Design an enzyme around this catalytic site. Structure first.
Site, short mmCIF file in Angstrom:
data_model
loop_
_atom_site.label_atom_id
_atom_site.label_comp_id
_atom_site.label_asym_id
_atom_site.label_seq_id
_atom_site.Cartn_x
_atom_site.Cartn_y
_atom_site.Cartn_z
N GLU A 140 20.93 45.93 20.09
CA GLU A 140 20.58 46.18 21.49
C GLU A 140 20.98 45.07 22.47
O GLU A 140 21.13 45.29 23.66
CB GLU A 140 19.04 46.44 21.62
CG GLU A 140 18.54 47.58 20.73
CD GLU A 140 18.83 48.92 21.31
OE1 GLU A 140 18.50 49.97 20.79
OE2 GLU A 140 19.39 48.82 22.47
N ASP A 186 21.51 51.34 30.56
CA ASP A 186 21.90 51.61 29.22
C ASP A 186 23.17 52.43 29.19
O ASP A 186 23.74 52.81 30.21
CB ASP A 186 20.75 52.13 28.32
CG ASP A 186 20.38 53.60 28.34
OD1 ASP A 186 19.36 54.03 27.86
OD2 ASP A 186 21.29 54.39 28.82
#
Ligand SMILES: [Cl-]
Ligand SMILES: [Cl-]
Length: 162
Positions: free
Chosen positions: A11, A20
């Site tokens: 991540e 994102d």
């Protein structure tokens, strides 16, 4: 290697609201803030989550606090889930990490929808499970991360991450 190191590799760590891969407002180590277009809906969710006026910016300590919460929520979510629990229970430690990884990224509901893959894993049919998992939007959208998780399921080792 452990679940935290694993997810930190997949991540990243970001101290500023960001979007994102799907265009969603995120912060820290993969902490989804909102699915709403509004940057303001995001900054608000953010202050609510941290308990202070952040104005889209958090500290490292804060990122790790959210991370601890999210990993814990992921693991309890799996343990409470009638579909996920039996899979989790049947797996060895490394492959358990792989399931947590997917749950952290896609939520309990998303993973529980991988019906066939779940059956294969529970049946210990590694190779076939790997092929099935790849036939997904997930795999097509973030292929390098999906391949690392998939190899984890296939081999039962941390090779993809080392
Ligand atoms: Cl496909
Ligand atoms: Cl990726």
């Amino acid at each position: 290697m452990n679940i935290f190191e694993m997810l930190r590799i997949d991540e990243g760590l970001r101290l500023k609201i960001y979007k994102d891969t799907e265009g969603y407002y995120t912060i820290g180590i993969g902490h989804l803030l909102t699915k709403s277009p509004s940057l303001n809906a995001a900054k608000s969710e953010l202050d609510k989550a941290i308990g202070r006026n952040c104005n889209g910016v958090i500290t490292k300590d804060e990122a790790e606090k959210l991370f601890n919460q999210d990993v814990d929520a992921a693991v309890r979510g799996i343990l409470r889930n009638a579909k996920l629990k039996p899979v989790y229970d049947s797996l060895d430690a490394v492959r358990r990490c792989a399931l947590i990884n997917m749950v952290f990224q896609m939520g309990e509901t998303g993973v529980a929808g991988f019906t066939n893959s779940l059956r294969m894993l529970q049946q210990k049919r590694w190779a076939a499970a790997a092929v099935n998992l790849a036939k997904s939007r997930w795999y097509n959208q973030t292929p390098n991360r999906a391949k690392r998780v998939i190899t984890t399921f296939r081999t039962g080792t941390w090779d993809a991450y080392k």
